[PDB]
């Protein structure tokens, strides 16, 4: 909780407008009770009604603090989202654009800010200037630092080739001029869509949150009825219970923990989804991704799914580590595969490899091909192709070069280590081998076994033959594998998996597998221009990782079970709330009821203040759990229910006793009451 | 003492399950629209004569049918009670009832509550007892069993837009499950000492020379339908304490078996018709655990009675006040728990004379919603609402969409379940509040201290939760009391029936999935304990302050 964010969010909180409060019925009831207790306190201070006129004031102040804490939760979640929003948008608020009239560079560069310019224009960007437009490229070439999307700062080639000519967002260029024709208008710009997403928080509630609010409202109704009927019941026996005690019991009984933390949970979970390089338009799709029973992972362009990434560089006899990393960075520069992205990221992390001056090289770049499983460039007359070891062995044996030496025991060593060997070549001489290690610390096999223990099934689709698909399936640990994939075959697979009443979540290409993505219940689209994807739906994956649907399952089950755990906690606290307030509330109506005070508290007003203070402070103490979700252990459904009960139901039955006791002890030592 | 009570609980439970499992199979056959053996051939002729073609109807038509028949019963009973002196079978030539008592009795006997604000033997005639009370005891029970039949059918049927036939359901229930079993029970009651005559009130020359006017009548048949249909509307002032009503301990045992017979058989029928008996055994395990704990607590509280009896020179402190002598204190306690758990107004013992702790647990156990072996079908769909809450909470815990037995639970089901669970506690709370803010409600009082508020709260809970068991010290013959309790009975039964019917009509439109490893099972000790915790925790969160101002304050006093 950094101060420069928390203070500004508290400043946003301080507007306690009733219009912003009545959308949440639980804390609108709490707000109404707070205003009622405040008015009672002012009337008692003026002289309208007798009594303490300070106990009521303290109760009203702490109820106002409860309302402010719920608003602190909601605005803290909104500010945590808006920090990541302004980490990308804030550069483009104060910038400039270089306009042009013709695609030729040899023209007068017109100076227009172009912050509201329509589509179909022509602009220019050069020498580290921020790209202000989102369109296509007809000519030019430069290295582009996609920090605003990737978050790892890695150069990509943006040249007119057919697929590598699509800029996105306010993204930093690094080499030289690159003419751009923006094909969108503001509002459908990527940064504008992220603005609409971060300002689109809790505009439409998900069905899970709607049903949870229905249950919370029903609990609010029964608690309100009991509290309101206590005055006629206790007015007959002795003097009536004071109204401020009734309002304190009402607020302290109503579930205000989950009631104030629900929107915080939703916004923080969607912020966590945004931090996982996933563009989700609505949270209903995220909840469905948490709700599915089978997972389909389309491997057609990537290599060994997406868990395997670059770990370390193994050189050769006739090359140096710096030269090997230079060749690998130049080869994988023109690769949007997660493997090539990992190669670029590892090279940057090792030797700080940067801008390469692609236009001075004058090399035409060939991207990754699904059938060839190859990716390389055309510098001068040599090929810097790289890929799988069998494919590159076929490539080097297709020419007159001699077969490489010691690479067999090198790839044997990395296979004994347990990594996929990625090999680069200069055209005739093998320049080394790269070990692709799994990025999951616990292991992708253990993660898939945990998914199996969760009851959710994992299936991957491979475009290669039966042997490669079986090998990758045995290496990963999946349940079913497919070979020779066609869109008709995958649509039929989705239909026959849905035929047994199961929900299908499938990730794949948004441009090649769009009907099957629409057929699937959840669609984590990847490798797209993202414009029509976000228009149609089709939850956009940024770094095109096929295994991030597991990450959505994590962030899309964690939110739901955090909601359930906090709901059960807020329900279960009320037993200790009874044991604290009921003897305090009925101290004068029935003095025999002091035997129910099982905890040795001092005075009834001290008990009421202690219970109200704990009810206020539990929201602050559960801020980190609501922001981070729950660190949950993937097991069977019965085991998860048992663990969640043993943690949160027993917490709700135990820790309010301890908290009320220690708050009353602190009050008695400090002498306020 | 403790061994005798445990033996009584165990014997009653095992005999109940043994006698109720074949009735569970019979109710399963009625649910699956399969005619009973020996009934077809004349059932078709009866439906052809009655103009029912067994046409399937949806939830709107089905609920409208049941509600219209209930209004017809209410109107017929109200006119019969107003004009009972014109009707025959008047041994004492009793006058017609007042408007408030007639309306309260009509609403009470149509809403399967059977609250009595009067003395039967000096209020109602033989024709009134024979027709307007027994017919309503059949019809309200048949309506409840029909509602739970349609709910079980909604849980079975996959993507259909209809539920069943209301007239076929009520006719089958009344003619096959109700009339023969109540006939056997009434024949056993006449085997014991119970009235099934129509003689006038026989004057008795007492041995010491006093005068006794014995109230003869057709008592045994009304007893049998009262016990079988979980009704509780007695012939006399004492709903089951009268020796013309319960002459023997065997008769009392048959009474408790007949009370718990149809909820147990309906749980067994649910378990059989779902295909998996584990859900019915889950419901039975939860209700049996709560019931055993409640009987143990009430038996201990009645054994550890008042110390005033020991102080004023008696050989034992057992609270025998307000209890019959032919049945023990343990039997009276067990019947009190049975009748306050299963929505039955019949009482062996006067519940005012119970200890505060032994009268709290009947009160709380009927305030939770009357769901532990409750009503006749009524407690089973009360369990359905509570297990909908339980499966929603458990689905939230496991991170998946809630799903009870294949069908997912959505916003509309959540709204209707929340409303149905809201309906009866709000009636209890505002009815008791309105009774405590009016001198008309505070003038009918009998006992002082917190026991008086206990009496008021118990009466309002009896009206709203369709029990009819009364703290008999409260004088509910006031017009304000009659109107308030009648409103509570009406809104309670019909505003629980309507939203659970909308729940059934929402559930028929859904298709059940396949039970995967990721789906939470709805059986086992974990889910039984979760459902028990849900029911007791909701009942506590609704009624701990009221019980603290009433029976808890009395017990600590």
């Amino acid at each position: 909780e950094p101060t420069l964010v928390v203070q500004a969010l508290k400043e946003a909180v301080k507007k306690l407008n009733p219009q912003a409060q009545w959308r949440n019925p639980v804390m609108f009831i709490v707000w109404i009770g707070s205003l009622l207790t405040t008015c009672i306190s002012i009337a008692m201070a003026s002289g309208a009604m007798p009594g303490n006129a300070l106990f009521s004031a303290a109760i009203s102040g702490w109820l106002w603090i409860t309302v402010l804490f719920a608003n602190f939760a909601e605005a803290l979640a909104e500010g945590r989202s808006k920090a990541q929003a302004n980490s990308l948008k804030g550069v483009k608020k104060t910038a400039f654009a270089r306009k042009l009239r013709e695609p030729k560079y040899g023209a007068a560069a017109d100076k227009v800010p172009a912050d509201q310019l329509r589509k179909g224009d022509i602009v220019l960007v050069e020498a580290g200037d921020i790209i202000p437009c989102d369109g296509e490229v007809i000519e030019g070439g430069a290295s582009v630092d996609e920090s605003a999307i990737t978050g790892e700062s890695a150069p990509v080639i943006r040249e007119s080739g057919g697929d590598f000519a699509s800029v996105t967002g306010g993204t930093r260029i690094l080499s030289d001029w690159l003419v751009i024709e923006c094909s969108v208008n503001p509002g459908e710009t990527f940064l504008d869509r992220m603005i609409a997403m971060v300002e689109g928080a809790q505009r439409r509630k998900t069905p899970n949150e709607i049903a949870l609010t229905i249950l919370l409202i029903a609990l609010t109704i029964v608690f309100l009825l009991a509290t309101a009927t206590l005055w006629p019941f206790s007015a007959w026996g002795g003097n009536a219970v004071s109204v401020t005690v009734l309002v304190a019991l009402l607020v302290c009984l109503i579930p205000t923990t989950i009631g104030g933390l629900l929107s915080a949970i939703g916004v923080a979970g969607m912020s966590r989804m945004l931090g996982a390089n996933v563009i989700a338009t609505s949270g209903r799709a995220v909840e469905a991704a948490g709700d599915v029973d089978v997972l389909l992972l389309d491997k057609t362009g990537t290599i060994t799914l997406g868990n395997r990434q670059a770990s370390e560089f193994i050189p050769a006899q006739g090359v140096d580590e710096k030269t090997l990393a230079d060749a690998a960075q130049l080869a994988s520069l023109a690769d949007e595969t997660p493997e090539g992205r990992s190669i670029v990221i590892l090279a940057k992390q090792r030797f700080n490899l940067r801008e390469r001056d692609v236009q001075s090289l004058h090399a035409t770049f060939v991207p990754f091909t699904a059938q060839s499983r190859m990716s390389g460039i055309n510098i001068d007359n040599r090929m810097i192709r790289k890929g799988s070891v069998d494919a590159i062995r076929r490539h080097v044996e297709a020419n007159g070069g001699h077969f490489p030496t010691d690479v067999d025991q090198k790839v044997d060593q990395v296979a004994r280590q347990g990594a996929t060997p990625l090999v680069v070549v200069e055209g005739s001489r093998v320049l080394g081998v790269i070990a692709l290690k799994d990025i999951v610390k616990g292991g992708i096999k253990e993660r898939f076994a945990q998914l199996r223990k969760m009851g959710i099934k994992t299936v991957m689709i491979t475009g290669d033959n039966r042997l490669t698909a079986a090998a990758i399936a045995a290496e990963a640990g999946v349940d079913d594998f497919l070979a020779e994939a066609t869109p008709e075959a995958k649509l039929a697979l989705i239909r026959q998996y849905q035929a047994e009443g199961r929900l299908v979540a499938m990730t794949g290409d948004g441009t090649n597998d769009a009907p099957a993505l629409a057929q699937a219940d959840v669609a984590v689209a990847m490798n797209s221009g993202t414009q029509a994807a976000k228009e149609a739906g089709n939850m956009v994956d940024l770094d095109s990782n096929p295994t991030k649907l597991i990450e959505v399952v994590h962030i899309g089950k964690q939110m739901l079970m955090t909601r359930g755990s906090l709901t059960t906690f807020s329900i279960a606290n009320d037993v200790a709330k009874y044991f604290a307030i009921i003897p305090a509330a009925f101290a004068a109506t029935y003095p025999q009821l002091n035997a129910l005070n099982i905890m040795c508290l001092h005075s009834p007003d001290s008990a009421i203040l202690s219970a109200v203070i704990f009810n206020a402070l539990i929201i602050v103490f559960l801020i980190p759990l609501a922001l981070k979700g729950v660190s949950y252990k993937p097991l069977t459904a019965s085991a998860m229910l048992r663990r969640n009960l043993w943690i949160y139901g027993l917490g709700g039955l135990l820790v309010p006793f301890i908290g009320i006791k220690v708050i009353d002890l602190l009050l008695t030592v400090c002498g306020l009451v | 003492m403790a061994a005798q009570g445990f033996l009584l609980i165990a014997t009653f439970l095992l005999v109940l399950m043994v006698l109720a499992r074949p009735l569970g199979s019979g109710l399963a056959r009625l649910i699956n629209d399969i005619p009973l053996p020996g009934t077809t051939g004349v059932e078709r002729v009866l439906f052809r004569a009655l103009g029912v073609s067994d046409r399937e109807m949806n939830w709107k038509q089905y609920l409208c049918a049941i509600l219209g028949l209930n209004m017809l019963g209410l109107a017929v009973l109200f006119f019969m009670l107003l004009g009972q002196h014109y009707l025959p079978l008047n041994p004492q030539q009793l006058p017609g009832l007042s408007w408030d008592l007639a309306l309260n009795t009509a609403v009470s006997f149509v809403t399967n509550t059977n609250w009595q604000s009067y003395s039967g033997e000096t209020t109602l005639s033989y024709f009134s007892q024979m027709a307007g009370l027994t017919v309503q005891n059949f019809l309200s029970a048949a309506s409840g069993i029909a509602v739970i039949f349609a709910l079980i059918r909604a849980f079975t049927r996959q993507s259909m837009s209809t539920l069943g036939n209301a007239w076929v359901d009520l006719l089958r229930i009344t003619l096959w499950v109700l009339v023969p079993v109540a006939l056997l029970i009434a024949l056993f009651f006449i085997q014991q000492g119970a009235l099934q005559n129509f003689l006038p009130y026989q004057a008795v020359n007492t041995v010491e020379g006093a005068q006794q006017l014995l109230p003869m009548g057709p008592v045994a048949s009304q007893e049998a339908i009262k016990m079988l249909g979980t009704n509780g509307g007695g012939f006399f002032n004492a709903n089951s304490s009268h020796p013309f009503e319960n002459p023997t301990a065997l008769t009392n045992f048959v009474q408790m078996l007949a009370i718990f017979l149809i909820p147990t058989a309906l749980c067994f029928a649910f378990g059989e018709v779902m295909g998996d008996r584990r859900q019915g055994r889950m419901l039975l395990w939860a209700m049996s655990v709560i019931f055993v704990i409640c009987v143990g607590v009430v038996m201990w509280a009645e054994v550890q009675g008042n110390p005033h009896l020991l102080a004023l020179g008696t050989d034992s402190s057992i609270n025998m006040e307000g209890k019959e002598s032919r049945f023990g204190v343990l039997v009276s306690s067990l019947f009190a728990v049975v009748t306050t758990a299963a929505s039955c107004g019949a009482v062996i013992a006067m519940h005012d004379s119970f200890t505060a702790l032994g009268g709290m647990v009947p009160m709380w156990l009927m305030q939770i919603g009357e769901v532990v072996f409750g009503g006749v079908g009524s407690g089973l769909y009360g369990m359905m609402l509570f297990v909908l809450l339980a499966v929603f909470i458990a689905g939230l815990m496991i991170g998946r969409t809630p799903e009870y037995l294949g069908k997912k639970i959505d916003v509309r089901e959540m709204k209707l379940t929340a409303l149905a669970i809201l309906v009866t506690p709000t009636l209890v709370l505002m009815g008791a509040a309105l009774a405590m803010m009016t001198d008309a409600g505070r003038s009918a009082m009998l006992n002082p201290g917190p026991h008086g508020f206990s009496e008021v709260l118990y009466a309002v809970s009896s009206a709203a939760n369709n029990n009819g068991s009364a703290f008999a010290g409260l004088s509910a013959n006031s017009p304000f009391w009659n109107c308030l309790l009648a409103f509570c009975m009406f809104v309670g039964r019909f505003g629980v029936i309507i939203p659970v019917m909308a729940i059934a009509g929402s559930l028929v439109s859904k298709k059940s999935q396949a039970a995967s490893s990721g789906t939470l099972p709805t059986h086992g000790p974990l889910f039984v304990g979760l459902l028990i915790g849900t029911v007791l925790l909701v009942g506590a969160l609704t009624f701990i302050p009221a019980l603290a101002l009433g029976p808890v304050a009395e017990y600590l006093s």
């Binding site: 959308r23 019925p25 609108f28 009831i29 109404i32 009622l36 509630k205 709607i210 609010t213 229905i214 409202i217 029903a218 609010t220 109704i221 309100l224 009825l225 309101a228 005055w231 109204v243 | 916003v411 709204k415 929340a418 409303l419 803010m437």
Partner: peptide
């Protein structure tokens, strides 16, 4: 009854009506 009692009862009824309306709605 009295002014405070009747305004408390009416405020409870308006709060109950607002909560029932919120339960009926999905926002």
């Amino acid at each position: 009854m009295s002014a405070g009692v009747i305004t408390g009862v009416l405020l409870v009824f308006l709060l109950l009506g607002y909560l029932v309306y919120a339960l009926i709605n999905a926002e």
